[PDB]
């Protein structure tokens, strides 16, 4: 009886195995755009993905992860609210059963159809496992998805999903360029938070871009054909794998833009 997104093991149950679920800096949150304060001392984000080396795509039973070689400074996030260099290790998405829900963060209570998370770890801690034990260990770049025009740079991801339908399946996934998933503007909100799945560790500087990307209805429909279950188990569609907004508590969301 492990955690998931069903009626009996979903987000409202997670605190029983992971008491930090009720902690002081949990994610996601609602971004109230009128209360977020412009911080002119924030620097522009630096997204340096030209040398990124993707390796594999994995259905882990909760989402699918596109994994990268993080044994060198190849794809890094710097600047913005960050001190130091954060290396890209994986990206994944959260999405809904319907276009009206799916994102984890919300904007003035608006839910997007999906949300992309590009996960990076602070190189001063040496590896990801040590980084998640630190309050400034991770930087997650969050990007909202709305349904409209197709995102051409997403299609290579969509087309491999048939090969990783069920939990525990992986496939080679080399030469994928995550620059094709970015919007035009890098304007962002930022706040201190957590992993949005167990173990819910309070180790993330969240950087959420204001500009969503557009994906097509056909692209998101293919996300919804994935399975939470393993092969040869009863089919449960991988949909609504999002945690709802958590209390902001004693935190301020800062904006990079006026
Ligand atoms: N929704 S989230 O807050 O961004 C969030 C982000 C990351 C995690 N955990 C990991 O990444 C662990 N890990 C590490 C290397 C890897 O290759 N694959 C992988 O899974 C959990 C939640
Ligand atoms: Zn995530």
């Amino acid at each position: 009886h492990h955690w998931g997104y069903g009626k009996h093991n979903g987000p409202e149950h997670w605190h029983k195995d992971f008491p930090i679920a009720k902690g002081e800096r949990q994610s996601p949150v609602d971004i109230d755009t009128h209360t977020a304060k412009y911080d002119p001392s924030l620097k522009p984000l630096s997204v340096s993905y030209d040398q990124a080396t993707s390796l594999r795509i994995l259905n882990n039973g909760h989402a699918f992860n596109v994994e990268f070689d993080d044994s060198q400074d190849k794809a890094v996030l710097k600047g913005g609210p960050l001190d130091g260099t954060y290396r890209l290790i994986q990206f994944h998405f959260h999405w809904g059963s319907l276009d009206g829900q799916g994102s984890e963060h919300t904007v003035d209570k608006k839910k997007y159809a999906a949300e992309l998370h590009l996960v990076h770890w602070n190189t001063k801690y040496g590896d990801f496992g040590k980084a998640v034990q630190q309050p400034d260990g991770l930087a997650v770049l969050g990007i909202f998805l709305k349904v409209g025009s197709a995102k051409p740079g997403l299609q290579k991801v969509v087309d491999v999903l048939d090969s990783i339908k069920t939990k525990g399946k992986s496939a080679d996934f080399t030469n994928f360029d995550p620059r094709g998933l970015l919007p035009e503007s890098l304007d962002y909100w930022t706040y201190p938070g957590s992993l949005t799945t167990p173990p819910l560790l309070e180790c993330v500087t969240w950087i959420v871009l204001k500009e969503p990307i557009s994906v097509s209805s056909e692209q998101v429909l293919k996300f919804r054909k994935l399975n939470f279950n393993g092969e040869g188990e009863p089919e449960e569609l991988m949909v609504d794998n999002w945690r709802p907004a958590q209390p902001l508590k004693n935190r301020q969301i800062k904006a990079s833009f006026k």
Side-chain angles (χ1 to χ4, degrees), residues 163-204:
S163 73
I164 58 155
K165 184 178 178 175
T166 50
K167 177 174 54 185
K169 287 193 159 348
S170 66
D172 298 312
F173 202 67
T174 56
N175 302 103
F176 180 78
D177 188 341
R179 292 177 295 184
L181 300 176
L182 302 177
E184 166 189 334
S185 176
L186 298 181
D187 288 347
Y188 63 86
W189 298 283
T190 184
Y191 75 97
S194 72
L195 304 180
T196 68
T197 54
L200 301 169
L201 296 169
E202 289 180 338
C203 61
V204 181

Side-chain angles (χ1 to χ4, degrees), residues 5 27 56 58 60 65-68 70 89-90 92 94 104 117-119 128 132 138 140 194-199 204 206:
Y5 296 96
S27 295
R56 195 178 71 141
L58 170 70
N60 61 22
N65 290 356
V66 175
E67 300 164 351
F68 289 78
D70 66 349
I89 178 163
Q90 55 101 334
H92 61 274
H94 307 260
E104 298 207 302
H117 290 165
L118 293 129
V119 182
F128 180 87
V132 298
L138 294 195
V140 184
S194 72
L195 304 180
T196 68
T197 54
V204 181
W206 275 97

Side-chain angles (χ1 to χ4, degrees), residues 28-161:
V29 300
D30 180 56
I31 300 168
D32 191 272
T33 64
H34 289 108
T35 299
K37 196 191 160 75
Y38 172 62
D39 185 346
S41 80
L42 285 171
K43 298 146 184 222
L45 264 190
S46 174
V47 183
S48 294
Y49 288 170
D50 46 292
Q51 296 295 123
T53 294
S54 68
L55 293 172
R56 195 178 71 141
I57 191 171
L58 170 70
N59 179 332
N60 61 22
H62 308 289
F64 63 86
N65 290 356
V66 175
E67 300 164 351
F68 289 78
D69 173 16
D70 66 349
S71 70
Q72 287 185 268
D73 275 355
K74 286 178 173 186
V76 300
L77 184 66
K78 309 191 317 158
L82 305 172
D83 291 332
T85 296
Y86 290 69
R87 270 189 208 161
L88 181 64
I89 178 163
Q90 55 101 334
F91 72 76
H92 61 274
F93 304 80
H94 307 260
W95 61 93
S97 57
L98 309 154
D99 297 348
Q101 64 200 48
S103 67
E104 298 207 302
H105 294 89
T106 53
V107 181
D108 297 333
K109 302 295 180 86
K110 177 189 172 68
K111 294 174 170 89
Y112 286 88
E115 185 174 331
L116 165 61
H117 290 165
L118 293 129
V119 182
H120 312 74
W121 57 272
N122 192 330
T123 61
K124 74 190 276 236
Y125 301 124
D127 67 46
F128 180 87
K130 288 291 265 300
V132 298
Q133 300 178 59
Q134 317 304 324
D136 60 352
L138 294 195
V140 184
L141 182 60
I143 304 177
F144 296 116
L145 280 59
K146 68 184 185 182
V147 172
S149 303
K151 192 70 163 176
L154 181 61
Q155 192 59 35
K156 282 183 191 188
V157 172
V158 168
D159 281 333
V160 79
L161 297 180

